[PDB]
Amino acid sequence: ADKSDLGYTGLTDEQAQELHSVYMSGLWLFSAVAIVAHLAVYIWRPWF
Template sequence: MNDPTPGDDRFGLRTYLTPEEAKEFHKIFMGSFLGFTGIAVLAHIALWAYKPWL
């Protein structure tokens, strides 16, 4: 594997992503993270309503 050429528009030494690919990955990652966090919050609220632990 060769490092990208200096004229290439890819970020970092080991990323090998173009700015458009990085933005797309970030969008998918953040959507997944927020979805998982939302489900976890709803599960905690439901469990708290069923059986408070404090």
């Protein structure tokens, strides 16, 4: 079933129960897994 407004859907507040666990925490721990890797990659070994 769909509603009316924005986002609806949405689906307020299915916009803050499913865009939070895997959208934020999925991409924030895709930023807590990617940034860290670089810190063994930036200098080993592009400098040669």
